[PDB]
Design a protein around this ligand. Structure first.
Ligand code: BCL
Ligand code: BCL
Ligand code: BCL
Ligand code: BCL
Ligand code: BCL
Ligand SMILES: CC[C@H]1c2cc3[nH]c4c(c3C)C(=O)[C@H](C(=O)OC)c4c3nc(cc4[nH]c(cc(n2)[C@@H]1C)c(C(C)=O)c4C)[C@@H](C)[C@@H]3CCC(=O)OC/C=C(\C)CCC[C@H](C)CCC[C@H](C)CCCC(C)C
Ligand SMILES: CCCCCC/C=C/CCCCCCCCCC(=O)O[C@H](COC(=O)CCCCCCCCCCCCCCC)COP(=O)(O)OC[C@@H](O)CO
Ligand SMILES: CCCCCC/C=C\CCCCCCCCCC(=O)O[C@H](COC(=O)CCCCCCCCCCCCCCC)COP(=O)(O)OC[C@@H](O)CO
Ligand SMILES: CCCCCCCCCCCCCCCC(=O)OC[C@H](COP(=O)(O)OCCN)OC(=O)CCCCCCCCCCCCCCC
Ligand SMILES: CC(C)=CCC/C(C)=C/C=C/C(C)=C/C=C/C(C)=C/C=C/C=C(C)/C=C/C=C(C)/C=C/C1=C(C)CCCC1(C)C
Ligand SMILES: CCCCCCCCO[C@@H]1[C@@H](O)[C@H](O)[C@@H](CO)O[C@H]1O
Ligand SMILES: CCCCCCCCO[C@@H]1[C@@H](O)[C@H](O)[C@@H](CO)O[C@H]1O
Ligand SMILES: [Mn+2]
Lengths: 50, 286, 10, 38, 47, 32, 306, 39, 39, 50, 39, 38, 39, 50, 39, 50, 50, 39, 50, 38, 50
C-alpha cells in the first residue's frame, strides 16, 4: 500500500497520508501568497514602522 | 449464595439488648427499647425533652412578646451586652436563653444516641465524629465566643431571615472578612465537598445497570485525570473533607472578636519583611 | 430476579 | 513509527489558528490602524 | 395593604412549597424502594 | 479582655480538632 | 466488545502517555491506591491544553508588565495582581487598550474554548469505555453558572466591567462588589436556595463517607457488587439510619440524592445571579415589599462598636 | 402498550390545576383592582 | 386493577383540607376586614 | 461500500461519506457566494477601512 | 486503521465556523462603526 | 535509548515559541521603538 | 545500581539554568542601572 | 533500519529519525540567518544600547 | 541497613544551598548597605 | 553497551549516554567563554560596583 | 560492587556512589575557596560591621 | 524494641536547629541593637 | 551487624548508624566551638545586657 | 509495642519547647529588662 | 529482652528503653541546674518582685 510514496519517504508516509499531505502543502502555499499581498496592501495604507 | 429476603428477617436478626453507654455505666439501660421504627434509650429521652421545650419556648417568644404571626418577621434576640453574663427572668432575652439551653441539650443527646446505636450494630465511630464537628461549631458560636467576649449578647438571634442580619453586621464589623485565612480555607473545603459529591454520584450512577466489569470506572478515571483514587479512598476523602470544612471555620469566627479587630490590618506584615522591602520605586514602594 | 437497583434480571 | 502525521497536522493547525486570533486581538487593541474606529 | 407583591409569590413562596413537597415525596419513594424484597445475602450464613 | 478565659476557650476550640486527627492516625497505623 | 488494556496502553494521538505507571507510597497507605498514569492525550485534550496555556501566558505576562518586569516585586505582589475588564466608559466594545481591557478579552475567549473542549473530552472518553455519560452533564450544569458570570450577565447589563478580574484577590472583590451594588444578597431568594443545596451537599457527603467507612469491615465500599446483592455492611448501614431517622435508602439511590443535590446548586445560583441586576435592582427593598424583612426598631448597637 | 398511565395523567393534571388556582387567587388579591377583603 | 389505593386518597384529601382551612383562617385574620380578634 | 468512490480516495472514503461530502462542499460554495455578496453590499453602505 | 475520520473533521469545522460567526458579529456590531439597530 | 527524539523536538519547539512570544511582548511594552504606536 | 539517571540530571540542570537566566535578566532590566531598553 | 545513519550515531538514530533530524537542522539554520538580518536592520533603525 | 540514601541527602543539600543563597542575595540587595545595582 | 566509555566510568555510563554527555560539556564550555566575554564588555560599558 | 570503597565505609557506600561522592566533595571545596575570596573582597570594599 | 528511630531523631533535630537559627537571626536583625546591615 | 558497636550500645545501634552518629556528634562539637567564639566576639563588640 | 514511654517523652519535649518560646517572647516585649535595646 | 533492667521494673522497661530513660533523666537534671543558675543571675541583675 506504499506505491505512490517515493522510496525516500517510505518509512514515514502512506498512500492516504501522502494524499492529505499534498492537500495540506498546497493549502499552505496558497495562504502564503495571500498573506504577502495583504501585508503589502496594509503597508501601502499606513506603515507601522516609523 | 443470594436469595430474596423480605427485610423483616434482616431487621429482626440484628436486634440485640443492652450494648449501649448507659448499659455499661449503670449496668442497665432504663429506656432500652424501640418505639415504631425509632430506638429509644437514654439520651433518646433527654433529646426529645429538649426538642419539645425548645420548640415551645421559640414559638412563645415569637408569637407572644412580639405579637406577630408572620414566621419570617420574628427577632428572637439575646439580652443586651450591658447585662453581662447574667440571666434575669424579668428582663428581655430570657426566652432566648431558655431556647438556647434546650437546643444544646437536644443536640448533645442526639450525638450520644448516635454513639449508642453505633455500639449496638458493632460499627465504627465515624458518624458521631462527623456530627460532633458541627455540634462543636454550634457550641463555639453560642457558648465559647460569648463567654470569652464577656456577654450573652454576643450570640446570634434565632430569627429565620434575621440571623442573616447578625451575620452581615459581624462580617462588616471585622472588614474584610474575605481576607480571613481560616475563612478562605473553609470556603475552599465547602466547594471541594460539593465537587467531590457530584463526581462520586456521577461515577457510581454511570456504571449501575450495565454488563461491564468493576474495573471500567478505574480506566475511566485514569484516562481523564491520570489518577484513580479507589473505593474506600473516596469515601474516606468525603468524610475527612466534610468534617474539616467546619473545623477550620470555627477558628475564624472565634478569633474575629477576641485576638483580632481588623482583617485588612492583619496583612500589614507581608510587605515589611526584609526579603523584599525597599526594592521598588514610586507607587511600587513597600 | 428482583435486584437492589430496581432491575429484574433473569 | 516514530512520528505520526495526524499529530503534526492537529498541532500545526491549532497553533496557526491561535496565533492568528492573538495577532488580530493585539492589533485591534493597539489603535494604530483606523479599522473599526467609530 | 397587608399583602406581598406578586413577585413575592413567584420567587419566594411557590419555590419553598415545591422544595418541601418534593423532599417529602422523594423521601417516601426512596424509603419505599429501600425496604422491599430483593436479592440479599442471608444474615445467618454471612455473619 | 481577660486573656485567661479567652485562652481557655481557644484551647477548647483547638481540642475540637482531636477526633479527626485520631481518625487519620488510626487509618495510617492500621494500614501498613 | 471493549478491550480495557488497549484503551489504557495504546500509542499515537488517540492513545496514552506516561505509559510505565508510577507509584506513590503515602497515597497507597492513606487512600488505598497509589498508581499514577497513564493519561489519555487524544483529540479534544490537546485543544484544551493549548488554549488554557495561551490564556495563562497572557495573564502572567500582563502581571509582569504591571509590576515593571521586576521579579522581586512580582513575588511580593503576586496575590493582589489582576487583569480587569474594560471600565464602564466602554460598553461591550472590543476596541480597548491592551493595558485597559484587551488582555482580559483575549484570555477569557481562550478560557471559554478550553472549558468547552474539556466537556467534549469527558463525553467522548465516557462513551469510549463502557460507562454512561453522567459526569458530562454535571459539568454542563456547573458551566451554566460559569457562562452566566462571564458572558451573559455582562451582556444583559451592557458592560464588560460586570465580570470578575483574573486574580487571587479579584474574585473576592467581585463577590463583595456585586453583593453591594444590587442591594443585599442575603435577601435574594435564589441565593437562599443555592445555600440550601450547598450545605445539604456538604452534609450528605459527610454522612455517606462516614457511614461507608464505619461499615467497611464487611466490604460495603464495593458499591458495584452491592447493587446486585447486599451483604452485612449495607444491611447494617440501612438499620443504623432507620433506627436513627425512621427511614433509609439503598446502595443505589443514595448516589441519586448526591447527584441531584450537587446539580441544583449551580442552576439555582445561575438563575439568581442573572435576575440580580436585570429585574430586581435592589433586594432589600424587594424583600420589604414581599414581607420577609423583620422590623428591628431599636437595635442594640453597643455590640457593633469598639 | 399505551404511552402513558392513567395515574400519571391524574397526578399531573390535579397538581397543575391546584398550583395555578392558588397563584391566580393570590395575584388577584394583592393587585387592588377589586374591593375584596379590604379593611 | 385500580389506579389509586383508598389509603392514599384519604391521606391526600385529609391533608389538603386541613392545610386549606389553616391557610384561609390565617389570611382572613390578617386581612383586617372583620372585627374578630381585635383588642 | 467503496463503490461510488473514485479509486484514488477509496482508502479514505465510503459511499455514504462520499454523498455527505458532496452535500457539504455544495453548502460551502453557496455560503461563500452569499458572503461575497454581503461584503460587497456592506462596503457600498459604509467602508470599514479609512 | 483510518488515519482520518470524516465525521470528526465535519464536527470540528462546523463548530469552528459557528463560533467564528458569533464572535465576528459581536465584535463588529458592538463597536459602533455601523449604523445598525439605533434607537 | 536514554533519550527520545520526539520528546526533545516537542520540548525545544515549545521553549522557542515561549521565548519568542515573551521577548515580543516585553519589547512592545518597553516603549523604546516606534512600533504599533496609537 | 546508580544514584541518578543521566536524563534527570540533564533535565534538572537545564531547567535551573533557564530559570536563573530569566531571573538575572529581569533583575538587571528593572534595576535601572544600565541604559538598555529605554524611552 | 540503520543504513543511512553514520557509524558514530548508530545507537541513537534510525533512518526516519535521521531524515527528520536533517529537516530540523536545515530549518534552524535558515531561521538563524533570518534572525541575524532582522537584528542588523533593527539596530540600523534605532540602537537599543546607549 | 543504612538510615539514609545518598540520593536523598544530595537532593536535600542542593535544595537547601540554593534557597539560602537566593535568600541572602535578596536580603542584602534590599538592605541598601552596599551600592551594587543603583540607578 | 559499556564499550566506548573509559574503564573508570563504566558503572555510570553507556555509549549513548557518553556521547550525549560529551555534547553537553562542549556546549557548556562554549557558553562559559561567551559569558566571560559578555561580562567584560558590560563592565567596560558601565561598571556596576561603586 | 564494594571494590573501590574503603573497608571502613563499605556498609554505607557503593562504587558509583563513591565516585559521585568524590565529585561532590571536590565541588564543595572549590566553592568554599571562592566564597572566602569573595567575602574578603567585599569586606575590603565596604565593611558591614560598624 | 528501640523506642525511636535514628532517622526521625536526625530529621527533627536538624529541622529544629535550622528553624531556630533563622528565627534568632531575623529577631536580632529586626531589634536594631547592633549595627550590622545599616545604611 | 553489631560488630563495630561497643557492648553497651549494641541493643540501640546498627553498624552504619554508629558511623553516621559519630559524624553527627563531631559536627555538633565543631559548631559549638564556633558558636562560643562568635558569641565572645559579638559581646566584645557590643554587649547586649545593660 | 507499648506507647507510654514514647507518649510521655514526646509530650514533655513539645510542652517544654512551647513554654520556652512563649515565655521568651513575653519577656522580650515587656520592657522590664534591658536585653535587646537600641 | 530484659536482662539489664532491674527485676523491679522488668514489666515496664526494655533493654533499650532503660538506656534511653537514663539519658533523658540525666538531661533533665542538667537542664534544671542550668535553669537555676540562670534565674539566680537574672534575679541578681534586676529583681522582679518589689
Ligand atoms: C462587512 C463588515 C465587516 C465584516 C463582518 C463579517 C460578519 C458579520 C461575518 C463575516 C464573515 C467573514 N468575513 Mg468579514 N467583515 C469584514 C471584513 C473582513 C476582512 C477584511 C480584510 O477586511 C476579511 C478577510 C473578512 C473575512 C471574513 C471571513 C472570515 C468570513 C467569510 C465567510 C466564510 O468564511 O464562509 C464560510 C461558509 C459559511 C459561513 C457557510 C454558512 C453555512 C450556512 C449557509 C449558514 C446559514 C445559516 C442559516 C440562516 C441557517 C438556516 C438553515 C435552516 C435549516 C433553515 N472580513 C468587515 C469589517 N464578516 C462571516 C463568518 O465569520 O463566517 C464564518 C460572518 O458571519
Ligand atoms: C534544538 C536541539 C535540536 C537539535 C538541533 C541540532 C542543531 C542545530 C545541530 C544538531 C547537530 C546534531 N545533533 Mg541534534 N538536535 C536535537 C536533538 C538531537 C538528539 C536527541 C536524542 O534528541 C540527538 C542524538 C541529536 C544528534 C545530533 C548529532 C547527530 C549532531 C552533531 C552533534 C555534535 O556532534 O555537536 C557537538 C556539540 C557541540 C560542539 C556544542 C556546540 C554548541 C556551542 C558551543 C554553543 C555556542 C555556539 C557558539 C556560537 C559557537 C562557539 C563559540 C565559542 C567562543 C567557542 N540531536 C534537538 C531536536 N542538532 C549538529 C549537526 O551538525 O547536525 C548534523 C547541529 O548543528
Ligand atoms: C550538571 C551538568 C552536566 C555535567 C556537566 C559536566 C562538565 C562541565 C564537566 C563534566 C565532567 C564529567 N562529568 Mg558530567 N555532567 C553531568 C552529568 C554527569 C553524570 C550523571 C550520571 O548525571 C556523571 C556520572 C557525570 C560524570 C562526569 C565525569 C565523567 C566527568 C569528569 C568528572 C571529574 O572527574 O571532574 C569533575 C570536576 C570536579 C569534581 C572538580 C571541579 C568542580 C569545581 C571545584 C567547582 C567550582 C569550579 C571553579 C572554577 C573552582 C575552581 C577553582 C578553585 C578556586 C580551586 N556527569 C550533568 C548532566 N560534567 C568534566 C569532564 O568531562 O572533564 C574532566 C567536566 O568538565
Ligand atoms: C531576660 C531573659 C534572658 C534569658 C534568661 C533565661 C532564663 C531564666 C532561662 C533561659 C533559658 C534559655 N535561654 Mg535564655 N535568656 C535570654 C536570652 C536568650 C537568647 C537570645 C538570643 O537573646 C537565646 C537564644 C536564649 C536561649 C535560651 C535557651 C538556651 C534556654 C531555653 C531552653 C529551652 O529552649 O528548652 C526547651 C527545649 C526542650 C524542652 C527540648 C530539649 C531537647 C533537646 C533540645 C534535644 C532534642 C533533640 C532530640 C533528638 C529529642 C527528640 C526526641 C524525638 C521525639 C525523637 N536566651 C535573656 C538574656 N534564659 C532557660 C533554661 O532552661 O536554661 C537551660 C531558662 O530557665
Ligand atoms: C527571669 C525573668 C522571669 C522568668 C523568665 C524565664 C524564661 C525566659 C524561661 C523561664 C523558664 C522557667 N521558669 Mg522562669 N522566670 C521568672 C521567674 C520564675 C519563677 C518564680 C517563682 O518567680 C518560677 C517558679 C519560674 C519557673 C520557670 C520554669 C517553668 C522554667 C525553668 C525550669 C525548667 O523548666 O527547666 C527544665 C529543663 C529543661 C527545659 C531542659 C531543656 C534544656 C535543654 C538542654 C535544651 C537546651 C538548649 C540547647 C541550646 C540545645 C542544644 C542542642 C545541641 C546543640 C544539639 N520562673 C521571672 C519572672 N523563665 C524557662 C522555660 O519556660 O522552659 C520550659 C524559660 O525559657
Ligand atoms: C460537618 C459538615 C456538615 C454537616 C454534617 C452532619 N450533620 C448531621 C450529621 C452530619 C454528619 C448527622 O448524622 C445528622 C443527622 O442527619 O441525623 C439524623 C446531622 C444533622 N444536621 C442537621 C442540620 C444541619 N446541619 C448543617 C450543616 C452541616 N452538617 C455541615 C456543613 C446545617 C447548617 C446550617 O449548615 C443544619 C441546619 C440535622 C438535619 C441533623 C441533626 C438533627 C438533630 O440534631 O436533632 C435535634 C433537634 C431537632 C430535630 C429539632 C430541634 C428544634 C429546636 C430545639 C428548636 C429551635 C431552636 C433552634 C436553635 C432554632 C434555630 C433557628 C434557625 C433559623 C437559626
Ligand atoms: C427547585 C426545587 C425543585 C424541587 C423538586 C423536587 C423533586 C421531587 C420529585 C422526586 C422524585 C419522585 C420519584 C417518583 C417515581 C419514583 C418511583 C420509584 O420507586 O423509583 C425507584 C427509585 O426511586 C427513588 O429512589 C426515589 C426518587 C429518587 C430519589 C430522590 C431523588 C431526588 C434527590 C434530590 C432532588 C430534590 C429532592 C429534594 C428537594 C429539596 C425505583 O423503582 P423501580 O424499580 O423503577 O420501580 C418499578 C415499579 O415498582 C414501579 O416504579
Ligand atoms: C424543627 C421543627 C421541630 C422538629 C420536628 C421533628 C418531628 C418530626 C420530623 C419528621 C418525623 C417523621 C420521620 C419519618 C416518619 C416515621 C416513619 C414511620 O412510619 O414510623 C412510625 C414510627 O413513628 C411513630 O411511632 C411516632 C414517632 C413520634 C412522632 C412524633 C414526634 C414529635 C416530636 C416533637 C415535635 C415538636 C413538638 C413541639 C410542640 C409545640 C411507625 O411506622 P409503622 O406503621 O410501624 O411502619 C411499618 C413498618 O415498616 C415499621 O414498623
Ligand atoms: C470535651 C470532649 C473532648 C473529647 C476528645 C475525644 C478524643 C478521642 C476521640 C477518639 O478518637 O476516640 C476513639 C473512638 C473509637 O475509635 P474508632 O471509632 O476510630 O475505632 C474504629 C473501630 N473499628 O472514637 C470516638 O470515641 C468517637 C467519639 C465522637 C465524639 C465527637 C464529639 C466530641 C468532641 C467534640 C465536642 C462536641 C461537644 C461535646 C460535649 C460538649
Ligand atoms: C387565596 C384565597 C383567599 C383563597 C384560596 C382559594 C382556593 C384556591 C381554594 C381551594 C380549596 C380547596 C382545594 C379545598 C379542598 C378541600 C378538601 C380537600 C377537603 C377535604 C376533607 C376531608 C375530610 C372531611 C376527611 C375526613 C376523614 C375521616 C372522617 C376519616 C376517618 C377515618 C379513617 C379514614 C381511618 C380510620 C377510621 C376513621 C373513621 C377515623
Ligand atoms: C457553663 C458556663 C456557664 C456560664 C459561665 C459564666 C458564669 C457567670 O458568672 C458571671 C460572671 O462570669 C460575670 O463576670 C458577671 C457579670 O458579667 O456575672 C456572673 O454571674
Ligand atoms: C452573541 C452576543 C450578542 C451580541 C449583542 C450585541 C450588543 C451590541 O450593543 C452595542 C453596544 O455594546 C455598543 O457599546 C454600542 C456602541 O454604540 O452599540 C450597541 O449596539
Ligand atoms: Mn458511595
Amino acid at each position: 500500500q506504499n506505491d505512490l510514496v517515493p522510496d525516500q519517504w517510505k518509512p514515514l508516509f502512506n498512500n492516504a497520508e501522502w494524499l492529505v499531505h499534498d492537500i495540506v502543502v498546497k493549502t499552505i502555499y496558497g495562504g502564503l501568497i495571500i498573506a504577502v499581498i495583504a501585508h503589502v496592501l496594509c503597508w501601502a495604507w499606513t506603515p507601522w514602522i516609523r | 449464595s443470594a436469595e430474596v429476603i423480605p427485610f423483616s428477617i434482616i431487621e429482626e436478626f440484628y436486634k440485640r439488648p443492652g450494648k449501649t453507654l448507659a448499659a455499661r455505666f449503670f449496668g442497665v439501660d432504663p429506656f432500652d427499647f424501640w418505639i415504631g421504627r425509632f430506638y429509644v434509650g437514654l439520651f433518646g429521652a433527654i433529646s426529645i425533652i429538649g426538642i419539645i421545650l425548645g420548640v415551645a419556648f421559640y414559638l412563645y417568644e415569637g408569637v407572644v412578646n412580639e405579637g406577630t404571626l408572620n414566621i419570617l418577621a420574628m427577632r428572637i434576640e439575646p439580652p443586651p451586652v450591658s447585662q453581662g453574663l447574667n440571666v434575669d427572668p424579668a428582663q428581655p432575652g430570657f426566652f432566648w436563653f431558655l431556647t438556647m439551653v434546650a437546643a444544646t441539650i437536644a443536640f448533645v443527646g442526639w450525638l450520644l444516641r448516635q454513639i449508642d446505636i453505633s455500639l449496638k450494630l458493632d460499627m465504627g465511630m465515624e458518624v458521631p465524629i462527623a456530627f460532633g464537628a458541627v455540634v462543636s461549631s454550634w457550641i463555639t458560636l453560642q457558648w465559647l465566643r460569648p463567654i470569652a467576649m464577656g456577654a450573652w449578647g454576643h450570640g446570634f438571634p434565632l430569627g429565620i431571615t434575621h440571623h442573616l442580619d447578625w451575620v452581615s453586621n459581624i462580617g462588616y464589623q471585622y472588614y474584610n472578612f474575605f481576607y480571613n485565612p481560616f475563612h478562605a480555607i473553609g470556603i475552599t473545603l465547602l466547594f471541594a465537598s460539593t465537587l467531590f459529591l457530584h463526581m462520586h454520584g456521577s461515577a457510581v450512577l454511570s456504571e449501575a445497570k450495565r454488563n461491564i466489569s468493576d474495573q471500567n470506572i478505574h480506566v475511566f478515571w485514569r484516562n481523564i485525570l491520570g489518577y484513580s483514587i479507589g473505593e474506600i479512598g473516596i469515601h474516606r476523602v468525603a468524610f475527612w473533607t466534610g468534617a474539616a470544612s467546619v473545623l477550620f471555620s470555627n477558628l475564624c469566627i472565634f478569633l474575629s472578636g477576641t485576638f483580632v479587630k481588623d482583617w485588612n490590618a492583619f496583612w500589614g506584615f507581608w510587605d515589611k519583611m526584609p526579603i523584599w522591602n525597599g526594592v521598588g520605586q514610586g507607587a511600587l514602594v513597600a | 430476579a428482583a435486584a437492589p437497583a430496581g432491575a429484574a434480571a433473569a | 513509527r516514530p512520528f505520526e502525521f495526524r499529530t503534526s497536522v492537529v498541532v500545526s493547525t491549532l497553533l496557526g489558528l491561535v496565533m492568528a486570533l492573538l495577532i488580530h486581538f493585539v492589533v485591534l487593541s493597539s489603535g494604530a490602524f483606523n479599522w473599526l474606529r467609530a | 395593604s397587608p399583602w406581598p407583591v406578586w413577585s413575592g409569590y413567584a420567587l419566594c413562596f411557590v419555590p419553598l412549597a415545591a422544595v418541601i413537597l418534593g423532599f417529602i415525596i422523594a423521601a417516601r419513594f426512596t424509603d419505599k424502594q429501600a425496604t422491599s424484597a430483593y436479592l440479599r445475602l442471608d444474615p445467618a450464613k454471612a455473619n | 479582655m481577660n486573656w485567661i478565659v479567652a485562652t481557655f476557650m481557644l484551647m477548647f476550640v483547638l481540642v475540637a480538632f482531636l477526633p479527626l486527627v485520631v481518625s487519620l492516625a488510626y487509618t495510617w497505623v492500621t494500614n501498613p | 466488545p471493549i478491550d480495557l488494556h488497549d484503551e489504557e496502553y495504546r500509542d499515537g494521538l488517540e492513545g496514552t502517555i506516561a505509559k510505565p505507571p508510577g507509584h506513590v507510597g503515602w497515597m497507597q497507605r492513606l487512600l488505598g491506591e497509589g498508581q499514577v498514569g497513564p493519561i489519555y492525550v487524544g483529540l479534544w485534550g490537546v485543544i484544551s491544553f493549548i488554549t488554557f496555556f495561551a490564556s495563562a501566558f497572557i495573564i502572567l505576562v500582563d502581571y509582569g508588565r504591571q509590576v515593571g518586569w521586576n521579579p522581586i516585586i512580582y513575588l511580593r505582589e503576586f496575590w493582589n495582581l489582576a487583569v480587569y475588564p474594560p471600565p464602564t466608559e466602554y460598553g461591550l466594545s472590543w476596541n480597548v487598550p491592551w493595558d485597559k481591557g484587551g488582555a482580559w478579552l483575549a484570555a477569557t475567549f481562550f478560557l471559554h474554548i478550553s472549558v468547552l473542549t474539556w466537556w467534549a473530552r469527558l463525553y467522548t472518553r465516557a462513551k469510549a469505555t463502557g460507562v454512561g455519560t453522567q459526569l458530562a452533564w454535571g459539568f454542563a450544569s456547573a458551566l451554566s453558572l460559569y457562562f452566566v458570570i462571564y458572558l451573559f450577565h455582562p451582556l444583559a447589563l451592557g458592560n464588560w466591567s460586570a465580570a470578575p478580574g483574573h486574580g487571587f484577590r479579584a474574585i473576592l472583590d467581585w463577590t463583595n462588589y456585586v453583593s453591594i451594588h444590587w442591594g443585599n444578597f442575603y435577601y435574594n431568594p435564589f441565593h437562599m436556595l443555592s445555600i440550601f443545596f450547598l450545605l445539604g451537599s456538604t452534609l450528605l457527603l459527610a454522612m455517606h463517607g462516614a457511614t461507608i467507612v464505619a461499615t467497611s469491615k464487611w466490604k460495603s465500599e464495593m458499591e458495584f457488587t452491592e447493587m446486585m446483592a447486599e451483604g452485612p455492611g449495607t444491611q447494617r448501614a440501612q438499620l443504623f439510619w432507620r433506627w436513627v431517622m425512621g427511614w433509609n435508602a439503598n446502595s443505589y439511590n443514595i448516589h441519586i440524592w448526591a447527584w441531584w443535590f450537587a446539580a441544583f446548586t449551580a442552576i439555582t445560583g445561575a438563575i439568581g445571579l442573572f435576575l440580580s441586576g436585570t429585574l430586581v435592582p435592589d433586594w432589600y427593598a424587594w424583600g420589604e415589599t414581599a414581607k420577609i424583612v423583620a422590623p428591628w426598631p431599636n437595635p442594640d448597637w453597643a455590640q457593633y462598636v469598639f
